[PDB]
Amino acid sequence: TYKYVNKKEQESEVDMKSATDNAARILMWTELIRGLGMTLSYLFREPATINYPFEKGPLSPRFRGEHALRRYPSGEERCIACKLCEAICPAQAITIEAEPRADGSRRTTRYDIDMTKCIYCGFCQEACPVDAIVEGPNFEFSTETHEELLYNKEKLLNNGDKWEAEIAANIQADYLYR
Amino acid sequence: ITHTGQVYDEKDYRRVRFVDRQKEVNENFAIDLIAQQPVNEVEHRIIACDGGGGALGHPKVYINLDKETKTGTCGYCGLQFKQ
Amino acid sequence: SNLIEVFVDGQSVMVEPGTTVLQACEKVGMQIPRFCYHERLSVAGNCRMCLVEIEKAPKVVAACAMPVMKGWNILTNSEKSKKAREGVMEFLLANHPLDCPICDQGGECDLQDQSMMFGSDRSRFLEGKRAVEDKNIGPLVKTIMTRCIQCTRCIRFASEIAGVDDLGTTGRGNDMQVGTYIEKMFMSELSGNVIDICPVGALTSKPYAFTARPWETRKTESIDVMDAVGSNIVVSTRTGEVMRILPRMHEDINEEWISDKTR
Amino acid sequence: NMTLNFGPQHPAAHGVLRLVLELSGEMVRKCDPHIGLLHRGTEKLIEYKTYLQALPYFDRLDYVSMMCNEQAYSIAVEKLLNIQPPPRAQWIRVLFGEITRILNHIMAVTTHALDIGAMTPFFWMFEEREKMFEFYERVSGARMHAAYIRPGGVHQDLPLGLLDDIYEFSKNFSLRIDEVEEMLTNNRIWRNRTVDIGVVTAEDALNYGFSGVMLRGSGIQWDLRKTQPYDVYDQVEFDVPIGSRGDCYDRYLCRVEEMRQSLRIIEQCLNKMPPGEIKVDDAKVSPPKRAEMKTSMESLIHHFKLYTEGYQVPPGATYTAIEAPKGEFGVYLVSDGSSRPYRCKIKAPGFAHLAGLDKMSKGHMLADVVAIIGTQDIVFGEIDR
Amino acid sequence: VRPRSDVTHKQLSAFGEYVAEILPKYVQQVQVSCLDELEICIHPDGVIPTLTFLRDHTNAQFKSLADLTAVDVPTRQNRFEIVYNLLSLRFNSRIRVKTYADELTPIDSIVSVHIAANWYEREVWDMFGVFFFNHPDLRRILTDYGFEGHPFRKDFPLTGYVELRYDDEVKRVVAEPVELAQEFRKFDLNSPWEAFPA
Amino acid sequence: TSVKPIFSRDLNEAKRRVRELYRAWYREVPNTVHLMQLDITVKQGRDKVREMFMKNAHVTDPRVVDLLVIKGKMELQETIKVWKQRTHVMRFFHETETPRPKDFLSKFYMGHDP
Amino acid sequence: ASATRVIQKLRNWASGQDLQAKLQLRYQEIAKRTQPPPKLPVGPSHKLSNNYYCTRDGRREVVPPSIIMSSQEKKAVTPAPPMKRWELSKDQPYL
Amino acid sequence: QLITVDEKLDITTLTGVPEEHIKTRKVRIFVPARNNMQSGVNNTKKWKMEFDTRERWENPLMGWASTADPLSNMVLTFSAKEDAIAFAEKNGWSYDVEEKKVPKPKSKSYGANFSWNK
Amino acid sequence: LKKTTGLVGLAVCDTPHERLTILYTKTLDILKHFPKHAAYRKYTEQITNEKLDMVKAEPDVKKLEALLQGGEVEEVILQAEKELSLARKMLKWKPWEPLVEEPPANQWKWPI
Ligand SMILES: COC1=C(OC)C(=O)C(CC=C(C)C)=C(C)C1=O
Ligand code: SF4
Ligand code: SF4
Ligand code: SF4
Ligand code: FES
């Protein structure tokens, strides 16, 4: 099904009345005045902006935001170094090397997410079997120096501890969907 | 210092990085935090650790607590269970 | 002379009398999904994951153990021989403990892949699983044997390639556990090969427990210098430090095996 | 001819464009656009990445129509795997595909005006655009660059409040098009700036491979959404807005109509979205559900292999074209049996359009060229790839 | 499993024969994928002739060039596989004509047949190095002005050999041999087990 | 053997084209050093041209030579029709990079893999 | 909203439209957050019976391209049936 | 008409490779062996030629591996030994081909394991 | 009769039946030189003869547009002379000849 836009169905022959109406349109800028009315109208509408520090634009539970590594309620970090979070990262951001901890458990000696390399796809959130690496809600982590953006296990684990309460609520809300 | 005894030697220069800055480490260390949790005294030879929370936990696995001497430990949580 | 002609899906390959059905598929180029069959280990038939369908025959045959016969057509990809694999893989997986992110034979599993390629997408085992007590077989091999698919390749190697004759099956039913009855370590050279030969990650290497994961390992083919047999070996290096040395096959020198010292 | 380059920093240059202009006086006699300022190596990087981990790249080729772009890769990979997405997923892709064409057109119409000098239309619609991204963020977690449309099916089910919120946006959006409609469609100043500028004749448009609103604006009747119905575009009713003459006005008017026609398609999708699964049930192609991978061994093996290695699509090659808001976006994916692709030629509606700038901007002033680029809706991510 | 209509695999198949018959001097192979897509294969010399017949034949009008690309099979003697995908708005069908070109054996240019190719042919030269005779203005389009090497060739390193940084001493941007701080981890992904006869 | 000729039937005819390009570059070096305000000496630059034109002196095959000038011509066009700014041109001189010694003892003293 | 009637009337007029009916700012009409928990439906293939994958795996039942005219009276045939002319819309043919 | 050239296609001059990495890089054409871990043989089919390995020094700030060799991660796959050798000759890289070594036929029969005297 | 064709550049051609009959008869003529059993000659002659026959048979252009498709009649005119141009071009090309050269072996083997 098609539709002609800007196709004049027929040649309306000028009638004085028509001509006057048109000539008035050119002479007294009638349509231009129409446009001014629209903007005056909004001037009276409530502005949609938010006080950025005081009010925040709404983000729902799946917002990917900033990486964090979670821990079991007991206190044992969730990651067991299966290293498929490294395998599926599209940007090669996550670097993981592991060795059996003294307890005998499997754990990662080094877990480094290069956030400048990361493109926040959220697949790592997807891939983890124990769901140790999660996309945390915080988006405000702008840093003065490039090195700060590179994150080792201690920053991510600390990021995990700080935001665990909200991360748990967010995962709680969206897990049925996944 | 860190979880893995990562401590720059007294002569290493990456210590310059920490000059005038905090070397980020976490007081809460897992090796210790799991220890605190007590051994679960289950009464069945084989029990399962779903990870706590089912889908919100870790892949389900069954542990054989048959060895009387030792206690089964979930390769995931580290939680220990004894018969 | 001594050249029967058997058809693998009508390809008229010709094989010496004595060749098994699995071997007939190999020369055409097809590969029967197999567990418990290793070229240099005796045929045992334990897994029955290789069931194929010779044409005009009531039942499917065991590839690795069936002497081929004249005329037979293998029908390896026949609807039937796929139910005969879609239904075996159902069983191996049913009693299997899903700790694939613990099993360091993660990408080195002939049971996930043979499951991702020749098996089903789901499970129907709503019942409970089993668990087998682990064993301290030694300081080199970590036997997390709840993983074992009772494929008896260890018991063979430990008897046929190496003359240890220690590892054995113990019991019957679904609690046949293939571990030393009394806890006597498997101390012998040629010991570490069990790791490489167990397709499951039940018993794997204890030093290389959790240092890596195979997709990452860059593999450079080199020569054994520890001993004068000069066994061929592959040095698996990640980010510039060697993580593992595992055998690579040289018919004449080390045919898929390497010493406990040089790995 | 006083060679002058439209350097990148200039706002009208879309950030990266070095149009070497030869100014025969103010009249410009020749343009030699020097693209390449945003070539990222998108198609040599994809060869080194598995099919799922290359999806994200397709959200960054045209960065103003993310999901429609990732519906072209998803359809391609799906063809090469002879798998089809479940019924609910196909409606969701059509629902998100039209939200993206409204999103691209708000981008194209308002930024064109920003270049010409009308500043208010951009602000009114951009507030309506963040209303829309929210829909992306609420369904995928990313305002833009979602990764929601997956090679097989889509990734996660719609949250339980999205379709009501999409109705409320679509219910009131048309007045918003009506409002810039009044402010920038009859202004003698717009018409003069846009009418009779960059006229492209019908056969020339086909020969230059324009294939888009540029094809439809001159009267050729071609929409890959009705001609070769991909996904469900066979079960939704819409009218292609064919223009008559080809001036940059007729092309604007067509873009404003497609926003209106997309509201008609979005309405149908909310009214008729089926109950069902959002991703095909073959664990071999689409990853197993979180509960299943944590309770069934066959699912953990399938999750481990899919995330670590890949789908391993069967060897073959396909060119799949979908009507992206800019025009025909096509992926020629050549595939060996491996889990990672061998070649992925992204046909960008835009490589062809920018070539036409020299022919279209003929006998035109420095100012006309600003309108000529604006009416091609060119995003240099797609052209540079 | 995708729905497949054999109406197309028959229509397209027939057309393939029609093209082949009409242009037997150049058509080497004409196949229809299982995905209902035709792919006439032509000797490189048939570039001009086969396209023109498709652009201007009443029973096969293929007016617009969807794309011109060149896969590179290093094993193949003729490395590049120039592929031209065309669309027929009249018959609502697409066809692909693919030829083979080695590094120093140029292909003819079709800018005459379709001017769409003016840019894509420059793109193929810049990335793969195939040369197109009779091209109006062949010159690098996507790569940097001084770039050395053709990037999409399978034999070109991803990271490349040169990277840019600003040097104060010389107060100007300056190439240096690439030094990467985390090399691309080359995960080996192929599984040692095949999937089907194919 | 049995190759098709790209543009030059034989090394002889091909060499003709190289001569032309050399001339072109030779005549152009001075202009560039002035339109780009490059801090180099025309003589110096002209030697560089010679360097490059000989770096590929060994090529014996006619087809390879022909492409080489096509490519060479393209570079000139980017430098006379100026689309290549100083950063691009000076790169030819490898001014910032530290030269590497080729003496074995030198390499031994510095790099694991020479 | 929350606009004194007069401002609204001026607004509606200057714009020429009842902008009040369709305000852009959202007020208590947007889906409340914490919508109820979702129990999503399991699709086909989850049957526990007659679910053999071999009977549902289009991935590799696909075959190598069919080949015609390999190098190694008759009526004319088109790429496909000539296309059918699109028909003018009926809700809004023009404009 | 075609012209005659006996010169081994060498196109080292057109490829655009830095001089150092064309004269100091040895590539090996080999058919990949099978990690003994798995028994599948689908990765021991096509020949591959791989450039010689180079420096991988540790990075001071994060400890990540760092490499200065561009042709390191590049492994091209060639279907036959003849074609791979050709690639090395025209690109000018040195080559040292390794013959494919395929498992020799081995005679197996379940009956043997039950032999009266083995 | 019509005011204008949908396509922007194309212009209404009065005497369209006459213009088509001129072009169609010309092509038939040029094809007369093609080798006798040449595939292009037999195939295009069949298409062109049917097109003329219909153009001769139908005196109403609107129904003529329906009978040989072509959308607007003006397009059919462009397609016919485009074909006339190619017919002249192919006579020079001589594509009816056998394959120029067989593909190098393994040139078309995709799994690689
Ligand atoms: C909508 O098209 C585009 C613009 O013009 C309106 C641009 O300005 C720009 C960049 C503009 C600036 C300075 C933010 C981009 C990227 C673009 O895509
Ligand atoms: S996936 Fe989850 S668990 Fe496995 S390594 Fe990455 S983070 Fe640790
Ligand atoms: S063996 Fe280890 S890896 Fe293979 S399946 Fe069982 S657990 Fe997963
Ligand atoms: S241990 Fe490995 S080899 Fe021995 S039986 Fe269990 S699985 Fe087979
Ligand atoms: S391989 Fe056939 S029985 Fe195990």
Ligand SMILES: [Zn+2]
């Ligand atoms: Zn646990």
